[PDB]
Amino acid sequence: VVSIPINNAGFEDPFIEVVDDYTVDTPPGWTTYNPNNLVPEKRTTWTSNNGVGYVGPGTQFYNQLAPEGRNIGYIYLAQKPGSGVAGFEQILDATLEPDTNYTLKVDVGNLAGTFKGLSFAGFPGYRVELLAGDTVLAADHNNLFIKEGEFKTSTVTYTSTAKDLHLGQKLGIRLVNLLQDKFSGLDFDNVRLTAEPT
């Protein structure tokens, strides 16, 4: 079993000093997955946005600390349910190899609580994708039940054969807010990808 390198895999960059403070800019190492043009180039707290947030001691929005380190990565979509999807994408240096079992794990979080008169009750749905090139090899579309204020680990698996059409193509990861309901923000952390010969 080999670990595949991912940049900023736990969204620990940038460092954030104040509990529950957050950025509204794409996390370093990641790009914004934006197929429905829901996230603008220039963001504020009020627009659809994504960024990192410090889930530290006494957090108002979770029953636990971050799955890993200080920070999580979050996506918030302001448009009404059904408007489309958005999230994070990262293309990796590793390529798809034959006769290899891939296992992608990501913790997914459901915010709880209240932020100045606003309820974070509800959850938009998530999808975790493993890519080769532009092809989604495997994905977990919203199978886990995630309680308010908790994180749960999503596992995505793909097994390549000797003749896979996508061999030699770059691996990628997408972490997607499905905007299927409100509150329509969610969190991700602790992205891990392993490869093991079959």
Per-residue b or e along 27-55, where b marks 16 or more CB atoms closer than 10 Å to that residue's CB: beebebbbeeebbeeebeeeebbbbbbbb
Q: Which of the listed partners (a copy of itself, Ca ion, none) does 37 bind, with a CB threshold of 5 to 8 Å by partner kind?
A: none
Report the distance separating Cα 121 and Cα 118, nearest Å: 9
- Residues near a copy of itself, by CB under 8 A: 81-82, 101, 121-123, 125, 129, 135-145, 156-159, 161, 163-166, 180-182
Residue placing its CB nearer to Ca ion in the complex, 100 or 110: 110
Cβ count near 86 (within 10 Å): 25
The entry of a copy of itself, Ca ion, none that residue 189 binds, CB within 5 to 8 Å by partner kind: Ca ion
Alpha-carbon distances of 35 from 1, 41, 72, 92, 170, rounded to whole Å = 33, 13, 23, 20, 20
56 is in an annotated binding site: no
Consult the annotation and say whether 122 binds a ligand: yes
> Which partner from the list a copy of itself, Ca ion, none does 110 bind, CB cut-off 5 to 8 Å by kind?
Ca ion
At closest approach, how far in Å is the CB of 23 from a copy of itself? Answer: 29
Annotated binding site for Ca(2+): 10, 12, 68, 71, 110-111, 120, 122, 148, 189
